[PDB]
Amino acid sequence: EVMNRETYKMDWSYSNSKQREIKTEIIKTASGSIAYCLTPDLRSPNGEDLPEMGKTSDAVYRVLLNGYPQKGPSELGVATTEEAHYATQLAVWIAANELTEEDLVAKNERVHNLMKRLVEASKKETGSQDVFFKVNPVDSQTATQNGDYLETGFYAVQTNAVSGSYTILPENAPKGLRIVNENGEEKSTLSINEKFKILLPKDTSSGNFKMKVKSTLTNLQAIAFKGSEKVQNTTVLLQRNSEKISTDLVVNWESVGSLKIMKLGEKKEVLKGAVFEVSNENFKQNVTTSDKGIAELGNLPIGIYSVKEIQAPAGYVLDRSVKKIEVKTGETAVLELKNENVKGELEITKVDVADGNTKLPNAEFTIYNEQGKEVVKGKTDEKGVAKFKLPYGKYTYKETIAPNGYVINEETFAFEIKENGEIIKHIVQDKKVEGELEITKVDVADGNTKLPNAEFTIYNEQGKEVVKGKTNEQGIAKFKLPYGKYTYKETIAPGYVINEEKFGFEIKENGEIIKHIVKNKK
Ligand SMILES: [Zn+2]
Ligand SMILES: [Zn+2]
Ligand SMILES: [Zn+2]
Ligand SMILES: [Zn+2]
């Protein structure tokens, strides 16, 4: 920059060593800003292009931050711009080790007061031209749930810059990432005085990513310019931009939920012992249901899980159909399942022991459970069948009313409903009531005298003939007949007249022998 000069009147300080008044001028650049001189021994420039050589010391820098024209005369504690300027130049020379305080003799106490203040500030304050840049916090951060999002805390840019901005550059980050400031405003490029926070949708699988903070900072700096060495070096306080980038900042998170399986029967009741296979890619586990019908799994990575019954409870139907359920971040997905009771049937067919093809109706069977309580009764139909729909478990049954004309069956049978829809078919046999008629034929005069050749004929309740038989020897004629009411009469005489009385009898007990005596005449 080309530099330009302007003189003024002042109560100059005197140097005892140099034996002269210490003077200066106001030096101004082409743009208009005020430059200061770095030594009182060489003259200031007039209309010469001066090249940059670097920076002054931080001590000299601190004088310019605190002095004129950064601050005006009233703020600094002096009366005029000339007094403000002169005290600043003197403090610049003292901080640069070109003059010492004890060598100078002041002629203006306002000027002397300000010079002391600016020199004390160069020694005590800590402002520096080294550009400082840091992102807090420095350690890798973990995002935790807050309603709809997983979120970190706030990050902040610590710097000695006067102004600047920065941009967040995430590497391979998840979908739906948002970056916000403290007012909740969505931004990727922010001012250095703003803080930022990371949001991720809660439904994001566990993971991590790296990000970088890139910034453009503006620092004040006391730039030095190189005189010809017959002409002084100068300084100008200027704003200078500077690019900075952080090291990789890591963000990580963990996304899990739970699954609760509730097991029910046909009516809303708790069910123990149901075993389910909970699975997906990366996971498999068989869980069994508890006292309260509940099976639970925690810490499941979020996503779709398959649920499949592998083993049913005691006396319940197995259902191998697959169920699909989503585990979401922070939440317990509930799966409520009903189960069907195992049901089957007993089919009793009632027949005659002598003939398997003869079916017997109206025979009653009673059914008992494991403990022996009566569960149900039922009679055989027109084809000798009795049907009983029953639930799971072990049972017994007995004949409790015999069919008409049969001896009751005394045995106890057993069966079990194991499998669903099973039909157990049983055959029960029955002994028919059969008996004998024995007619001893004697003469009406002589008792204990035989009569062969006497034929008797036996008729049923309706009156139709059944059997004929002559008297064998000793007057005896045997006839084996089934249950029922009958009548009988003499057909053929043994040289005797026929006894034409119509006798009657009933066979009603098995193995029974009915002994009758008929007598003949002439
Ligand atoms: Zn200060
Ligand atoms: Zn003084
Ligand atoms: Zn640490
Ligand atoms: Zn009863």
Residue numbers in the entry: 4 to 497, 499 to 526
Which passages does the manuscript contain on this structure?
TEDs are predicted at the distal end of a large number of surface proteins from Gram‐positive bacteria, and the name TIE (thioester, isopeptide, ester) proteins have been introduced for this family. Structures of Bacillus anthracis, vancomycin‐resistant Staphylococcus aureus, and vancomycin‐resistant Enterococcus faecium TEDs show a head domain with Class I topology extended by a β‐sandwich; the latter contributes the thioester bond‐forming Gln via a β‐hairpin insertion into the head domain.
A BaTIE construct (Glu35‐Lys557 of the full, translated open reading frame) was designed to exclude both the N‐terminal Sec secretion signal peptide (Met1‐Ala34), and a 38‐residue C‐terminal region upstream of the LPATG putative sorting motif predicted to be natively unfolded. Its experimental molecular mass (58,441 Da) was determined by ESI‐MS as 70 Da lighter than predicted, consistent with the formation of a single thioester bond (evolving one molecule of ammonia) and three isopeptide bonds (evolving two molecules of ammonia and one water molecule). The crystal structure of BaTIE was determined to 2.58 Å resolution using Se‐SAD phasing and standard refinement approaches. Further, continuous electron density between Lys297/Asn373, Lys384/Asp464, and Lys475/Asn555 side‐chains reflects the presence of isopeptide bonds, positioned adjacent to putative catalytic residues Glu343, Glu443, and Glu524, respectively. In both chains of BaTIE in the asymmetric unit (ASU), the electron density for IPD3 gets progressively weaker the farther away from IPD2 the residues are positioned, suggesting flexibility of IPD3 in the crystal. The BaTIE ASU contains seven bound metal ions in three unique sites. The third site is coordinated by Asp142 and Gln144 side‐chains belonging to two neighboring ASUs, and two water molecules. It is likely these are zinc ions derived from the crystallization condition and are unlikely to be biologically significant, given that crystal packing is a prerequisite for co‐ordination.
